[PDB]
Design a protein around this ligand. Structure first.
Ligand SMILES: [Mg+2]
Ligand SMILES: [Zn+2]
Length: 1478
């Protein structure tokens, strides 16, 4: 064992770089002889090489002397106060930039993430401490997952660490210089293989230490449970229980929780729901219509009468005088950076704008841009007039007397110098100044005297902070028109735009809009994105109105003025043929329109809840039985009068619709009311306030634990007995529920489980009664190591009864937004998630072994839908139920006690025992978790206590804080037993619900003479009854009710509570929000419309099109008509056009029909759009494509096309492809058509080049653990620091498109306007626009040579058309290459809007195939990018080739879940197009 020393010493002597830092450690190692010292020196040298490579690679100076940061400052003469203990590994000072380069090496995922979090937090803290120095700090962290470096080659380093390991184990077995813990740590660190190599058996590495608590818990689980009874000895207990329950219920001690339906009583209870303020029951429609148009200033302004303009004054409002041009130019100039703008380079701008205004004024007498005595400045300001005159005279007098000259001369000199500077700086980058239509004529020879001799007259524009004297007439606009929607759209656009203004008559900001004639000004006095006061002003009469709205909630109505009208119009057409509703048809329209406008004008949470609570009422109205505590659950607190008006409107509508004397069509009215109820999705999803929601969520979390009487406050890591005995005591108490055989009788809605029913369930599962036929068949060295960079310290060594030795599991609490209420959310670390995943997937597999669940399986959902459809068809009884408080009422103790009593059959009995031990240990771990209290809530509670302690309601949580606040304690952590991890433990609860419902159905079947089917996914259940029970319902109304009450009691006995929103009935069935009726179908139109409306994000404009396309494709399959989708697409295109972005024929197709969504796919619509653009030329290519596909189907060439033509020039090759056959070639003025691509060199900027397939491959490949360690966690940390909304996203998108957002040939940035200017320079190319607007250009052939720097952006059309067409024809049938034609022969019928028809589309792939094809076809790229990391594949090769060579959009030809079944209007299919495959 000594020759190894010699050879490795020689190898390291010959393979070490000559560094003045490395030679020291090299000689210190080479001089040593003792093996232990060799170990130390080798480890030190390896660490040195790694850290020096890291320090030199990132361009920094290495800290060899190990000096602290304040030392580094003091040596450089930088004086700083005292600081904490910090040592930088790499430090650099460059100007005012400071660089720190701490680094380390880790192999385990959990260790890597923990070290990253630790040093990141430490360095952020130190950055905060050093911010006072007035010097910037930027940390840099490098964490590598391997020992490879630069100063040493790989093989010598590997053999070095290997021989080091061998000598390590030798010396450990010889001298035992190390103890067990450090020795094991060093082995696991330098092993580089023990990071992650095992699975479930990893728990076998540690020790047990399970001394006493485990035995007590396991015994308490087994105390009084009997799980050996036979099938004969459970029926008797069931019968006895039923007998005593029925007797005690009939006597009058058991209450009963169900009533029979009564429509009149239900309506009468709904009408008198808020009878304390609305002191009436009836309301005339006319008075409501009258007082609706005068409620709020917004509504008054919406329906007022403002017809300013006699017909010629408004004509000038489309002239675009010089003032606006000067304003835009000055804004664009100020967007750059010029020096010394403080009170010098700003007054000049106002002077120029004022001169331009005077010039525009005294030539044709226009009155724009003014407001009383004020004008709009460069930065959307509202500067006055006189103060500017004073500043101007002061400045000119000072500058003149600083020095014969003349005032006008000084003014024109200053103006010309500044203008020359500006125009030079502008010409510098990419743009001339002649494209702004500005002229240097407003600078008259005499201007100062003109400034000093101006005057205006008007009013003062004011703002009032709260009688209302409106300057106009209140209401004169009919509801049937579409004017209020346009006014709302314009006002909302102004309100959203009001957020763009940046920070620095006090100061006033103004935005401008105009409806039809004159223009109005929205005035505000504060920046930022927050609630603030707004006013509306006009030049004739100022201060029209003022209000207190919030900006970020007014998005869904921007350009969607023609979309909502069609929505209401098509929703009305449903209830149109009711023979007893014609006399009341305008009232319905008025009410619907008023509700929509009102909910779009004042968005609030209370209106959302009130509108959401209607579906439960409409479901109960058409059923047989319902919970007794239903009506009381439909009431909530309302505050403002707008909400009361909304409630009155809803009441009037629901009384008009579901009155008496109507018996024609119940399904249509049901669908109508449901769609009305689903309008709550139009408001928003985000929160109005943040602190109150946190307080509410914490209150909901803390409430149900203060009556069970078990809350731990700040538990210690070393658990004391005072907590363990209490845990055991409460665990015993949890299993002490009585019922039906006691003195006090049963008690409802209390957490707990009874021993009798647990025993019954376990015994019935063990002996076998719940399986179908198809189921039974299946010490200085320590500090030395601490100096190292790869010696980890964050691995567990032994577990216990309360988690690993590091500490009990910890979680953080936070809310998640949702329509209506807000959901709770628990967040854990990575090791915790890795630990929980074992239980999760074990229980998921165990449940998959059985049948009936519908959580993640996708086969059972179709069976459920089929059974529901059949049951509804046969008019049987259906029970739709949801459970209440499912999360905070379950318990891991219940799952453990259930698992500890099941007996399996020949399932690796010894491994079965070992797995049971593992699972029991993990569940015992979960039972002892801890949850963190947020910081804002405790801070606010402390502030409130201090405030209202020295100077009533006393919410119980506030009482808890006040109690544990005054004795010297501050709550930080809270632990208990009653709370199951919301969303963490999910599949186990699904399994438990499955077995529980199966046992309950078995018992109910054993009592009566019928059977039941059930379906459930962890919180929702649908039960289907047979014919016997359905007959029993209407023959003996007493046995039915008793059976239902017994089902309720049984479910309560097993810790499952039925919510008051469940329903038993025969008319409708619902599961997972999917309603079904016998002779119709129920689409949710408003839901999909509202979902599609506000669903945009700030990204590249070619992915929003994909997202909207997928959304519309998903929505069409449910019943939405097509023209609505066309209008939605038009709205999206207009939203894009507003941002000044050129529209190309590869975004959307707003001319589709039914067939384009059923049969075709994404590429078919693009092909159809291109065919619509340029006909008379696509047929010639289509004939050649037909012939080529017919030839290639038999596999004739497959190679001449693959390389010779595809991988060459485009134009000439095309011609050859025509002479390869006997078809006529394309004309010379056919290859002239071309479009414009901005991403021809690199994609656009947001905040070499290779195909996108390479991008996604290197993304999905270099991310496992080692090739994707740093980047993913870095980007996650970066994204965690961002919080945004939809409006802010649209604003950011509008901002980025117009700054640079463009890259040049080599490396540079430009502007879009510059590109369009250079394009418009050459007067030989012709643009062309279509109706909806799609720009495409015609360019000649000769003009290309001579200026090849701007023509490198264009791209021909026929080439891409052929690529996409051939690709999609390969992907689909061969009919695509036919010739389409509309059907113009069928006559016109009279259709009803409610008539549907089903359809099926006209009908694996892996990641290795594309790699192998790219290898065997394109070896060049493969050997440099993929190497460092029969009939079916024959066409896959062609697919990937077409994808690589034609990169416009054909990527989607391979990136593509897709629905199958379609339900469409039968009146639409008979007007589609036909494609013939001949
Ligand atoms: Mg349900
Ligand atoms: Zn004018």
């Amino acid at each position: 064992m000594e020759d190894d020393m010699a050879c490795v010493k020689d190898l390291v002597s010959k393979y070490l770089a000559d560094n003045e830092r490395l030679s020291r450690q090299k000689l210190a190692f080479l001089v040593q002889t003792e093996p232990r010292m060799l170990l130390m020196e080798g480890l030190k040298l390896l660490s040195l090489c790694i850290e020096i490579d890291s320090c030199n690679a990132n361009g920094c100076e290495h800290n060899s002397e190990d000096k602290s940061v304040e030392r580094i400052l003091h040596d450089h003469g930088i004086l700083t106060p005292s600081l904490c203990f910090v040592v930088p590994d790499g430090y650099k000072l460059t100007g005012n930039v400071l660089i720190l380069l701490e680094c380390f090496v880790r192999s385990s995922p959990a260790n890597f993430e923990q070290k990253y979090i630790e040093d990141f937090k430490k360095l952020e803290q130190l950055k905060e401490d050093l911010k006072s120095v007035d010097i910037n700090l930027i940390p840099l962290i490098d964490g590598r997952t391997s020992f490879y470096n630069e100063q040493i080659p790989d093989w010598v380093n590997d053999k070095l660490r290997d021989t080091l390991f061998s000598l390590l184990r030798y010396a450990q077995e010889s001298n035992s210089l190390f103890e067990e813990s450090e020795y094991s740590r060093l082995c696991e660190s330098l092993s580089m293989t023990s990071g992650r190599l095992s699975g479930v058996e990893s728990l076998n590495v540690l020790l047990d230490n399970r001394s006493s608590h485990y035995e007590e818990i396991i015994a308490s689980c087994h105390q009084g449970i009997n799980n050996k009874l036979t099938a004969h000895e459970v029926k008797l207990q069931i019968e006895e229980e039923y007998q005593v329950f029925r007797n005690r219920l009939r006597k009058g001690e058991i209450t009963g929780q169900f009533l029979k339906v009564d429509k009149s009583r239900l309506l009468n209870d709904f009408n008198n729901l808020y009878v304390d303020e609305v002191t009436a029951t009836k309301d005339n429609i006319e008075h409501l219509i009258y007082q609706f148009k005068r409620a709020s200033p917004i509504l008054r302004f919406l329906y007022a009468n403002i017809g300013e303009g006699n017909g010629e004054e408004r004509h000038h409002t489309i002239k675009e005088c010089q003032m606006q041009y000067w304003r835009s130019f000055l804004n664009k100039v100020k967007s750059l950076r010029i020096l010394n703008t403080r009170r010098k380079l700003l007054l000049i701008f106002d002077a120029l704008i004022l001169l331009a205004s005077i010039h525009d004024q005294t030539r044709h007498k226009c009155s724009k841009g003014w407001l009383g005595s004020c004008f709009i400045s460069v930065n959307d300001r509202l500067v006055s007039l006189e103060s500017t005159k004073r500043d101007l005279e002061k400045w000119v007098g000072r500058r003149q007397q600083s020095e014969p000259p003349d005032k006008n001369q000084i003014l024109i000199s200053m103006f010309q110098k500044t203008i020359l500077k500006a125009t030079a700086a502008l010409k510098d980058v990419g743009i001339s100044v002649e494209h702004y239509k500005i002229n240097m004529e407003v600078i008259c020879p005499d201007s100062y005297d003109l400034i000093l001799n101006f005057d205006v007259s008007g009013v003062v524009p004011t703002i009032s902070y709260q009688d209302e004297k409106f300057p106009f007439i209140m209401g004169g606009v009919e509801l049937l028109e579409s004017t209020d929607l346009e006014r709302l759209s314009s006002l909302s656009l102004a309100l959203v735009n009001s957020m763009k203004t940046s920070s620095t008559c006090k100061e006033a900001y103004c935005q401008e809009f105009l409806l039809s004639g004159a223009e109005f000004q929205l005035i505000y006095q504060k920046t930022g994105e927050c609630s603030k006061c707004y006013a509306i002003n006009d030049n004739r009469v100022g201060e029209i109105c003022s209000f207190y709205a919030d900006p970020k909630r007014y998005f869904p109505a921007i350009f969607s003025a023609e979309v909502l009208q069609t929505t209401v119009s098509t929703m009305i057409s449903w209830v149109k043929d009711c023979s007893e509703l014609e006399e009341q048809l305008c009232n319905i329209n008025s009410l619907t329109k008023m509700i929509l406008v009102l909910i779009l004008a004042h968005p609030s949470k209370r209106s959302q809840k009130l509108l959401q609570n209607l579906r439960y009422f409409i479901m109960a109205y058409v059923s047989d039985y319902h919970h007794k505590d239903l009506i009381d659950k439909l009431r909530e607190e309302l505050i403002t009068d707008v909400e009361f008006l909304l409630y009155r409107l809803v009441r009037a509508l629901v009384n008009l619709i579901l009155s008496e004397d109507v018996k024609s069509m119940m399904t249509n009215r049901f669908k109508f009311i449901l769609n009305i109820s689903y309008m709550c999705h139009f408001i928003t999803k985000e929160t109005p306030d943040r602190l109150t929601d946190q307080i509410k969520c914490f209150e909901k979390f803390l409430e149900p634990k203060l009556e069970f009487g078990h809350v731990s406050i700040n538990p210690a890591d070393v658990a004391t007995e005072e907590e363990l005995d209490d845990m055991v005591y409460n665990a015993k108490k949890f299993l002490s529920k009585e019922g039906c055989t006691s003195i006090k009788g049963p008690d409802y809605k209390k957490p707990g489980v009874s021993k009798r029913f647990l025993s019954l369930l376990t015994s019935s599962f063990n002996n076998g009664s719940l399986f179908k036929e198809s189921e039974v068949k299946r010490n200085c060295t320590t500090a030395m190591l601490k100096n190292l960079c790869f010696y980890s310290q964050e691995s567990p060594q032994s577990y216990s009864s309360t988690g690993p030795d590091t500490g009990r599991l910890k979680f953080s609490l936070s809310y998640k937004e949702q329509v209506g209420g807000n959901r709770e959310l628990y967040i854990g670390d990575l090791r915790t998630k890795m630990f929980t995943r074992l239980i999760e997937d074990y229980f998921e597999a165990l449940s998959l072994q059985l049948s009936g669940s519908c959580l993640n399986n996708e086969r059972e959902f179709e069976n459920a839908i089929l059974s529901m459809k059949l049951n509804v068809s046969l008019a049987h009884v259906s029970y739709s139920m949801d459970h209440s408080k499912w999360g905070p009422m379950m318990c891991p103790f219940l799952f453990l006690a259930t698992l500890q009593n099941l007996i399996f059959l020949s399932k690796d009995l010894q491994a079965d025992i070992k797995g049971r031990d593992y699972l029991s240990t993990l569940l015992t771990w979960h039972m002892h978790k801890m949850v963190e209290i947020p910081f804002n809530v405790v801070s606010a509670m402390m502030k409130s206590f201090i405030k209202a302690q020295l100077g009533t309601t006393q919410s119980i949580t506030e009482d808890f804080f006040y109690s544990n606040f005054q004795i010297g304690v501050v709550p930080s952590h809270v632990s208990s037993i009653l709370d199951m991890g919301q969303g963490i433990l999910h599949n186990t609860s699904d399994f438990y619900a499955l077995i529980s419902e199966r046992f309950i159905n078995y018992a109910i079947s054993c009592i009566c003479g019928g059977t039941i089917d059930a379906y459930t996914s962890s919180d929702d259940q649908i039960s289907l009854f047979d014919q016997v029970l359905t007959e029993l319902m209407q023959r003996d109304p007493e046995e039915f009710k008793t059976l239902i009450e017994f089902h309720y009691y049984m479910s309560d006995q097993l810790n499952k509570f039925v919510s008051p929103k469940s329903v038993i009935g025969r008319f409708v069935a619902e599961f997972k929000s999917r309603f079904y009726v016998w002779g119709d179908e129920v689409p949710l139109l408003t839901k999909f419309v509202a979902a599609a409306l506000h669903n945009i994000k700030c990204k590249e404009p070619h992915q929003l099109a994909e997202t909207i396309d997928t959304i519309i494709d998903q929505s069409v399959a449910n019943g939405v008509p097509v023209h609505l989708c066309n209008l939605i697409q038009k709205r999206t295109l207009s939203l894009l056009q507003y941002a000044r972005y050129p529209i190309d024929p590869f975004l959307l197709n707003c001319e589709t029909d039914v067939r384009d969504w059923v049969d075709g796919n994404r590429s078919y619509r693009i092909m159809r759009q291109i065919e619509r653009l340029i006909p008379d030329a696509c047929g010639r290519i289509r004939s050649m494509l037909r012939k080529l596909y017919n030839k290639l189907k038999t596999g004739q060439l497959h190679e001449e096309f693959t390389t010779n033509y595809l991988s060459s020039e485009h134009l000439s090759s095309l011609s050859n492809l025509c002479e390869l056959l006997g078809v006529e070639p394309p004309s010379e003025s056919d290859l002239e058509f071309s479009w414009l691509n901005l991403a021809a060199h690199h994609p656009l900027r947001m905040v070499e080049k290779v195909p996108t397939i390479v991008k996604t491959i290197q993304n999905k490949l270099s991310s496992t653990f080692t090739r994707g360690a740093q980047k993913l966690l870095s980007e996650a940390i970066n994204k965690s620091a961002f919080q945004s909304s939809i409006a802010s996203g649209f604003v950011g998108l509008c901002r980025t498109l117009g700054s640079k957002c463009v890259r040049g040939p080599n490396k540079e940035s430009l502007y879009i306007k510059s590109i369009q200017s250079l394009i418009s320079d050459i007067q030989g190319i012709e643009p062309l626009i279509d109706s909806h607007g799609v720009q495409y250009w015609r360019v000649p052939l000769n003009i290309r040579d001579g200026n090849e720097g701007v023509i490198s952006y264009f791209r021909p059309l026929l080439w891409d058309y052929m690529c996409i067409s051939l690709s999609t024809a390969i992907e689909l049938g061969a009919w695509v290459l036919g010739e389409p034609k509309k059907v113009r022969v069928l006559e016109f019928f009279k259709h009803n809007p409610c008539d549907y028809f089903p359809l099926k589309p006209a009908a694996r792939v892996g990641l290795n195939h594309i790699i192998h094809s790219l290898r065997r076809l394109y070896p060049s790229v493969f050997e440099k990018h993929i190497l460092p990391f029969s009939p079916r594949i024959k066409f896959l090769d062609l697919c990937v080739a077409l994808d690589v060579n034609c990169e416009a959009l054909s990527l989607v030809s391979h990136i593509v879940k897709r629905e199958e079944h379609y339900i469409v209007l039968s009146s639409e299919l008979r007007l589609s197009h036909t494609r013939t495959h001949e």
